[model samples]
Target: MNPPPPETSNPNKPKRQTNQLQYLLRVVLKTLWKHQFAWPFQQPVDAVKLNLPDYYKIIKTPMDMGTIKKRLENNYYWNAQECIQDFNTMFTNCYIYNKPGDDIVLMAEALEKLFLQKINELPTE
Candidate 1:
């Protein structure tokens, strides 16, 4: 899928920044997204002009997406379980990350730690 444009016209403002989660979903899991109808228009919109909240609606407004929805609403921090469940929910019965109804607390916790700890370690421009 094509990503939103980079670079900004204003000399002062920083260009748009997308985190790992958004980029992964925007590029890789884009086909699995369920909010196509949520787009603001019938035709393709200008990706460069779309803002984060706009893309948020397109990407994460489905009510069935519980944890990830809350994660977006409440800052992008996600527990391990949320990430696992959200990923699984994107596809029907795929369960690639974790088994259905299986408790991935240890796995989740460790992953969450790494995600949080390392997410900020990278620099973006």
Candidate 2:
């Protein structure tokens, strides 16, 4: 007699699992957006408006919370690792743009710590 297939027969299983992960990511993002330190990072930096004309040249890859949220909603990230990278990039950009003792730089450090803590709190399957 043939052994029963060990693989799951449900074709939608993978998609459903992905949705669960996405939901968890959404929750983490919402928490970050509500944080006090999130104000400066909610949107892309305005180089001209902020008078940081060389910002673009220094930070080649600029990232922010709003952009991450939009990307999440659009299903641009296939997994949490990609999302994590974007968050790291956002913080790194802040570090590069601001002086070591700058308030924004400090905020970025705090926000990045919070982000990692939230990620660590996610339930593992």
Candidate 3:
């Protein structure tokens, strides 16, 4: 079954659906610290050709909404509290593979490292 947006739907429902994928792209826009625009440049993706996994399955945790908003807005947060709080909640509870002090920074770092490695290893079709 596909999941509806949690903020609008049920909090208890924890799953990814096609629409949720859109929300996820918005989230990635916010949190990823580097050239998110370059994400497209790094590699091309074909959603039609691939059967992607759940959002939770893709990362250690769910995305931070505040981080998302900041990225989209392209403004300063004044402090990292929002990112921190979202990170704490997502990793501690939402993430499939949670860890101690398994906070957002580490999680974000892992993603970047993986991206660089993935980009370098693969060839463009």
Comparing 1 and 2 by lDDT, which wins? 2
Candidate 1 vs candidate 3, lDDT winner? 3
lDDT of 1: 0.36
lDDT value, candidate 3, whole model? 0.37
Q: List the residue pairs that clash in candidate 1.
A: none
Scored by lDDT, model 2 comes in at: 0.74
Q: Which digits, one per residue and each the tens of the lDDT, describe model 2 over residues 16-108?
A: 336435754568889889999999988777777777778777877878887778767656655777677888999998888788989999898
Candidate that would win on TM-score: 2
lDDT of 1 by residue, 13-109 (tens): 4333246545433432233233332123112323345433443234432212333443434344333333445444433222233355554333433
Q: Specify the poorest-scoring 10-residue window by lDDT in model 1.
A: 37-46
Residue pairs with clashing backbones, model 2: none
TM-score order, best first, reads: 2, 3, 1
> Which pairs, if any, clash in model 3?
none
Per-residue C-alpha lDDT of model 3 across residues 1-125, encoded as one tens digit per residue? 12332232333544332322333334443334354322321221222333434433444334444334433244222233333344344433423443345553455456555433433332222
The reply for model 2, stretches above 4 Å from the true place, is 1-21
